[PDB]
Amino acid sequence: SMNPPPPETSNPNKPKRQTNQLQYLLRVVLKTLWKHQFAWPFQQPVDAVKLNLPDYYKIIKTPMDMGTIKKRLENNYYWNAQECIQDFNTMFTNCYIYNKPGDDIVLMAEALEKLFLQKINELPTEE
Numbered sequence: 001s002m003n004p005p006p007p008e009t010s011n012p013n014k015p016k017r018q019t020n021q022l023q024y025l026l027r028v029v030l031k032t033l034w035k036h037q038f039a040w041p042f043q044q045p046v047d048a049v050k051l052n053l054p055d056y057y058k059i060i061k062t063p064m065d066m067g068t069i070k071k072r073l074e075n076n077y078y079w080n081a082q083e084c085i086q087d088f089n090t091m092f093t094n095c096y097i098y099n100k101p102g103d104d105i106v107l108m109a110e111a112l113e114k115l116f117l118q119k120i121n122e123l124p125t126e127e
């Protein structure tokens with residue numbers, strides 16, 4: 001079984017804007033998570049072929065990862081901050097759905113989610 005194509009990261013047919021919250025999601029949220037000791041498994045799409053996990057994309061129909069989110073933010077793919085927050089939420093939920101609770105990857109995802117929630121609880125004000 002092949003990997004699926006990665007999620008779309010640009011689209012010239014959508015209007016674009018810079019906002020306080022979107023800037024914060026890249027400059028603070030993404031950048032801070034990216035530096036975490038346990039960020040590496042979440043920095044790019046899950047390579048189910050190399051991991052020999054052909055059931056990964058049988059189970060996970062909405063893949064998401066921080067590499068994709070980073071590109072989306074850089075490419076102004078999101079109009080609303082919540083679209084980006086939803087992508088982070090999806091990334092964590094995918095990990096929890098697919099993996100066994102005792103797996104290191106879940107411990108890692110949970111550590112990142114803790115940091116994520118700390119950062120989004122300090123989201124700046126909307127225009």
Ligand SMILES: CNc1cnn(C)c(=O)c1Cl
Nearest residue numbers: 041042046051095098105
């Ligand atoms: C490299 N990241 C991985 C690898 N395997 N699985 C099952 C995952 O959920 C993740 Cl995030």
